[PDB]
Write a protein that binds this ligand. Structure first.
Ligand code: ANP
Ligand code: MG
Length: 290
């Protein structure tokens, strides 16, 4: 059983299974593969861990809502595969020849790549806020899985792409708990998640996680790395109170835009009640490009 949302990208279930496939990576959700169709079309084949996918009726209903979600800065979801076995729960999207933000930030020196300039960092940030603006305001659906590994950097336009959106919409409580736990471990969970036994990703949690991304863009540090002081967000928050915010900036980059980005990032990581709406954040990041 293979379902395609549009007639734009068409293939068989037997064509997908007999396609040259290579592992992209593994996560809390499951594993990602790159599949190359006969005509050159490249797809992302994301297998959800067994027990993570909701029952067929709910999953189909929820994923069709996600299938209609389209934005230039969001990677298109083309379909899904539902097989006779319990492990055969696959989400199918476009494949982008890119490098993720976390891979760029951590392994840029090892690779040929030059560090991201101050302008590129502002640009990535605007492309992400643009996408969340649309999700939050027009579709009223949270991403809920924001992390630097879900931000893709490509040479072609648009420079930044957001992937793996709204997965909590398709999962059992088991699936959702594993996602929240992993986001907590990586540092993307807001302070209100501590007060709940079973917290759910939301429009509010997205703005928090977006704040952590802005901090990774500004410092050049991955969110889950411990710092001698300890938390990335705590580091910046502790440095700010001690009048030492400038010291957080990546040594590979100070343009006023970085300070603008910092004031926005700090607003994003405040309590739910003081946390700005995503349109305000998008507009404020956008004013920095002028
Ligand atoms: N198209 C891509 N180009 C480059 N890197 C990618 C691409 N897709 C995924 N990656 C990276 O490969 C790894 C696996 O991606 P993925 O399977 O989406 O897991 P994740 O991003 O770690 N977590 P999640 O998406 O929430 O399940 C991550 O380090 C991604 O940043
Ligand atoms: Mg991903």
């Amino acid at each position: 059983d293979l379902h395609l949302f549009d007639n734009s990208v068409v293939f068989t279930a037997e064509e997908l299974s007999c396609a040259p496939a290579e592992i992209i990576g593994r996560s809390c959700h499951g594993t990602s593969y790159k599949a190359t169709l006969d005509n050159g079309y490249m797809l992302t084949v994301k297998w959800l861990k067994e027990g993570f996918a909701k029952s067929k009726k709910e999953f189909s209903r929820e994923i069709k809502k996600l299938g209609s979600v389209r934005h230039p800065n969001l990677v298109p979801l083309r379909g899904y595969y539902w097989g006779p076995k319990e492990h055969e729960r696959i989400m199918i999207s476009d494949y982008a020849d890119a490098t993720s933000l976390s891979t760029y930030l951590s392994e840029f020196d090892e690779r040929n790549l030059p560090p991201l300039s101050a302008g590129q960092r502002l640009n990535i940030a605007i492309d992400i806020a643009r996408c969340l603006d649309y999700l939050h305001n027009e579709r009223v659906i949270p991403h809920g899985n924001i992390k630097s590994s879900n931000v893709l950097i490509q040479n072609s336009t648009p420079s930044a792409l957001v992937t793996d959106y709204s997965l909590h919409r398709l999962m059992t409580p088991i699936g959702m708990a594993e996602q929240v736990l992993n986001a907590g471990a990586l540092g993307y969970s807001p302070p209100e998640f501590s007060s709940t036994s079973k917290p759910c990703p939301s429009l509010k949690s997205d703005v928090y996680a977006f704040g952590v991304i802005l901090l990774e863009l500004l410092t050049g540090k991955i969110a889950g790395e411990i710092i001698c002081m300890v938390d990335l967000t705590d580091w910046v928050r502790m440095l700010d109170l001690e009048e030492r915010v400038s010291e957080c900036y990546d040594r590979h980059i100070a343009p006023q835009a970085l300070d603008g980005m910092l004031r926005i990032a700090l607003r994003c990581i405040r309590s739910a009640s003081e946390r700005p709406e995503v349109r305000t954040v998008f507009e404020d990041l956008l004013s920095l490009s002028s």
